[PDB]
Assembly symmetry: C4
Homo-oligomer: 274 residues x 4
């Protein structure tokens, strides 16, 4: 065999965590990533699996996720180190036959566990599966610097914040026509913040945690990463524009409207004011 570390999904996680670390998004253990897998993905690797897979209960039943494997970043683990030791810093987990817990099948060496934002991840997986008829496979959280910065400065109103990000790069509307949901600041790594994130994931493929980070959902690691990067690129242009005293001109409502029409996209109504 090839080792599981050489598999597309372990390699994908290395690539996405490293690229996010490279962006400045993932200081310390900041940020986390989980990718839903199929059985067919992990089964060719059954023989490189854990001494005996450890079971951890879920914070709450998740019957939709019954029998679902994921690969996931570990709690306390640094994005930077994933390329260096993926088996220490990643784990392959598989939720049990009625969504009450999971076995850690591979990785997370030395009694590591899945990310402390696992409630946010798994609950958002659940909603993204229903909301996209199962197409989304990734939930990604990173501390995207400019977006975080903007949360101290822009009205934390889903529609104004969406609209600013649409303006700040032409493509943004096309990439995220549903906009970006904003939560109130919440204590992170809780069931409550994961429920609230999962609820906005019903409506947006991006959700901001003010003064903390962003959560995105996508069909693949690249597309999820690129969703975020697009939101963050815009934030970065906006940071510069605001720091230079603000917009003198920008993309108008009609232009954003002609744009979503050409791209066959339905833009968040409430963000279409002026």
């Amino acid at each position: 065999m090839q080792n599981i570390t050489q598999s597309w999904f372990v390699q994908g996680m290395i690539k996405a965590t490293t690229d996010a670390w490279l962006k400045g998004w993932d200081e310390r253990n900041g940020g986390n990533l989980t990718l839903r897998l199929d059985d067919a993905d992990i089964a060719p690797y059954h023989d490189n699996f854990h001494q005996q897979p450890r079971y951890i209960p879920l914070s709450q039943p998740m019957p939709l996720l019954a029998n679902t494997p994921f690969i996931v970043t570990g709690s306390g683990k640094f994005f930077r180190n994933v390329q260096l030791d993926p088996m220490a810093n990643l784990g392959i987990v598989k939720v049990d036959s009625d969504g009450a817990g999971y076995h850690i099948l591979w990785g997370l060496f030395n009694e590591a566990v899945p990310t402390s934002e696992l409630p946010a991840h798994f609950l958002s997986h659940c909603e993204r599966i229903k909301a996209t008829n199962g197409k989304d496979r990734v939930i990604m959280h990173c501390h995207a610097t400019n977006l975080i910065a903007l949360t101290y400065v822009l009205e934390n109103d889903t529609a104004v914040f969406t609209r600013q990000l649409w303006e700040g790069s032409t493509e943004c509307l096309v990439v995220f026509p549903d906009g970006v949901g904003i939560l109130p600041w919440m204590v992170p790594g809780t069931d409550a913040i994961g429920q609230a994130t999962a609820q906005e994931m019903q409506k947006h493929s991006l959700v901001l945690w003010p003064f903390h980070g962003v959560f995105g959902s996508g069909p693949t690691l690249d597309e999820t990463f690129g969703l975020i990067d697009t939101a963050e690129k815009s934030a970065q242009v906006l940071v510069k524009v605001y720091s230079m005293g603000g917009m003198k001109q920008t993309i108008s409502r009609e232009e954003l409207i002609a744009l979503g029409k050409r791209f066959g996209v339905t833009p968040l109504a409430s963000a279409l004011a002026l």
Copy 2:
């Protein structure tokens, strides 16, 4: 043989896309690149060509481009991934004997197609060929962060924007004496925005799409890339200067004039106000 992936032009595209990705210019699939090739370039590689080359019609006849091969980035494809799988993310295309379409000869695996900005590219190739007696070979579009930022802030007037970029780095005038044309915001990935870009490519080797990006034209990938990088470096100094409250001193008209005279360059008149 060596594989085509080892050829100077596939390697050049890997180098230029990767370097642009590295700059922060090419979030997601943002940005695109096409390079005009000669027959002599691709012919030594005829035997590594496509199962059967797929034909796609052009949006409009382009008789100047009859029988011309290009290597081009694919629609939806990420600059970041080109180094990883050039054949998935690039394609070698060759316009047919009367400029009505092209066959995809190599790459663009899995039914990918050339960039959705192909009208902008090919039309601008057409004008750059006439305008430079065939010396330019590259059209490059990227989301150059500081230049985009400046479009929210500087008067979107070709001559004032040119002049600011000349000021923001001494060399700029020498590198782009013809200045940078500015389009009105337009819906991208359209025939109309490609015509309008191609029209300004008559007069400038750089063209700004406000709130979106820049288009440059050059004789080689490095020179085209470096054209852009020079415009963007200046924008970057200007962003900092404006963010610090503005210029207290700058390069004067006479100095810009003595400069274009020493370098044997004829600077855009309308940008020579004060």
Copy 3:
């Protein structure tokens, strides 16, 4: 044997210095790093040791550090070059049997010596050992750009500066609940500045040298590095926020309080004003 250069600690120092160089933190010889080792670490390597180990006296007796080996960056040496020649740029030192000096056992080729901030390092090691019952092993100093910038702008008051950094990224409080101590500007590379740093290391795992850099203490190179990076990431968001005219909203006192309670952390009282 494997060479000592292949050992976890020489490799760790290469990794941490290089990563800091990569961050922009360590222009020229700026910044320095020392890591406390056990005998068991260096002993398997006794046979690759120095021609004859050179003795340098300590600036003052340090009996707690009797018989303790460290690996340390060299005076005048660049973080950038460590990956290139670790034995030229690092040294393994071992304090003597009553804390009056050390022998340079390995590295520091060509009569190099340990960092000129060695008083700061060793004295802070001494206090961090007592303050953490011997868990901290690292002292790291770098010129962390945004934190330095903030020292010209924020009230240099431990509690206001701590509080701003807590606000500037949610996790900060959890990572450094003890806050960051601020020294008056002091002449660096002196016994006085090392005593003063060591004294604040009694109370904080981070200490700012205004208009110069930060000192952090940690159990491991990654954790020490990540402590710093977290403080600096926040500073970086704050720089952007202030540059955009300041905070419109931020994390409130109660939220910071609910946060330190969920994470089982006791946040610096004096920073809990409003």
Copy 4:
């Protein structure tokens, strides 16, 4: 033999140009570098030398430089590409027996020539040799972004600009106690701008070309590079500070004075106002 490309000086030039390219300092062909060599350096490589060495006259006699070899960047050549093809992008030159010209002994393939700032380089070499009793070996010019930005904003007065850079990082004074000279803007790539640069090189190891770049002089490539990086790091902190509305506190005159006394350095008097 080993090839000359593997020699310490070709490797040093690759390392310094690449690192500067990496910093953002050397867009396009911007920036240039020349390193004075000894005969003993190049002689072990005599047998890998040019088809027949081409002679180019000097713009003016330089008898001090008679029989002196240098390795130098080529005109129009990109710092980025040096690591890729050093022999295309670098050249080894040797001034003739009475300082009237040089033979290109190696590199600069395809009729490339030494940098168009060669008057600045060679004249500054001449002054740095006299001013340091022959210790300096490097002249380095790059478009250091923040320093360039500051030239639009700070009074272009040697003593105020020096003083700001001293403030903006503690170490700066120690690294460049002689300060940084400022020229009036001049047309670059001229004898006049090289004379004027060479004249300030009498007094400073750093010289600013406003709205263009910086020139530094050093004993080695690392030390010259690090001189610049230190000046630029400070500029970068200052850019942030000014962009946040300015300094509330900074390093005082007495502190800068105690600093230059501890480090055995004699700080530029005129920069010691307040």
